[PDB]
């Protein structure tokens with residue numbers, strides 16, 4: 395009993411469309427990955443299986459590349475890990491690119507695993523590769539990835555008989571480029587990458603009618619707007635804090651298409667995103683490169699230092715609605731939360747609220763979680779009426795974007811009940 399179906403679109407390959415009208419919040423599909431792996435910066439910081447950042451992680455005794463929070467996670471991961479383990483070990487000093495480790499797990503899954511429910515609607519076989527649109531620059535990078543895969547996997551895979559029938563590594567990597575999902579933890583931090591072939595039927599819109607959220611490696615696909623019968627289902631492949639020009643470059647470079655949506659035609663929100671003096675936000679955009687690199691490696695004290703140099707610069711400053719200033723405020727907030735600097739975190743967090751309202755319209759999981767963070771900071775600091783407003787706002791959003799099937803809704807409900815009990819006591 396599904397409310398969605400595969401169909402051949404007029405000009406964007408295959409897509410997913412509603413078989414019946416859908417309401418905001420409706421669960422449309424849920425999937426474990428065909429294959430997934432922790433990303434580089436989070437390796438050794440989060441559990442390889444559940445992708446949570448425990449304080450204590452045990453590394454696998456053979457390879458010592460995979461780390462686990464528990465015996466339970468080590469066992470649930472052993473089928474997925476058992477053959478890559480010998481490869482990671484054979485290349486003891488070197489570590490492969492995420493894409494290479496991912497495709498290794500794909501190969502082992504397809505060779506050794508039962509048919510995956512993640513492929514119910516659409517299989518890895520079926521995925522778009524866009525090879526006839528790749529630049530020769532891109533094709534050259536794919537060729538290098540193929541040779542990297544051949545090197546990394548030589549201990550377990552020496553020839554084609556150990557690959558699925560007529561499995562082509564070049565085409566496989568081309569598929570990974572435009573069908574990889576960035577797995578986010580409950581705090582919306584990027585922690586892993588995975589393939590969800592059924593979900594890969596969703597085409598892109600900068601104004602989508604559906605949204606995905608992750609609960610560990612588990613993916614929930616939900617409607618975030620009313621959707622009519624026969625209407626194509628879309629998600630936004632990209633970060634919302636991007637101008638139309640930046641979205642153009644990514645959708646070209648990674649997904650090989652020219653976005654024609656109404657937002658890109660109208661340059662919707664571009665002007666407000668780039669307010670302030672250009673030479674200032676050019677420098678911030680450059681600094682953000684290393685800030686996000688540091689954040690990807692959970693380097694919070696260094697993240698905070700770079701952000702303070704910007705937020706409290708002795709030189710000219712930017713409005714908080716400037717998307718680069720906004721990104722800096724958000725990184726500083728997360729840094730302060732992880733360093734226990736809760737007053738400072740709330741200062742930065744509250745500054746992001748109105749910009750997030752503008753740039754994450756409707757029901758977007760990123761805004762829901764941001765508002766929940768702010769409400770939780772306020773609750774801990776005894777600002778109950780303010781916390782309650784933000785916690786209910788987060789619930790308004792996340793009952794649509796997350797739903798009862800996501801464990802964070804249970805946590806939010808408990809915060810609401812705690813905050814309400816404090817307000818009632820008077």
Ligand SMILES: C[S@@+](CC[C@H](N)C(=O)[O-])C[C@H]1O[C@@H](n2cnc3c(N)ncnc32)[C@H](O)[C@@H]1O
Pocket residue numbers: 405406407408409520521522524572573593594595596597598599648649650651652653654
């Ligand atoms: C995750 S797949 C989506 C399903 C894909 N259409 C298929 O047939 O398998 C992403 C690819 O679909 C195409 N695509 C996605 N969104 C598009 C859009 N809005 N306009 C044109 N092509 C799009 C691009 O080729 C992109 O690389």
Ligand SMILES: CC(C)c1nsc(N)n1
Pocket residue numbers: 473474475476499502503504506507508
């Ligand atoms: C049980 C083992 C051989 C396995 N099944 S799927 C995968 N990646 N590994």
Ligand SMILES: [Zn+2]
Pocket residue numbers: 441442443444445446462463464467
């Ligand atoms: Zn775990």
Ligand SMILES: [Zn+2]
Pocket residue numbers: 454455456457458459460475479480
């Ligand atoms: Zn291992």
Ligand SMILES: [Zn+2]
Pocket residue numbers: 599600641653654655656657658
């Ligand atoms: Zn667009």
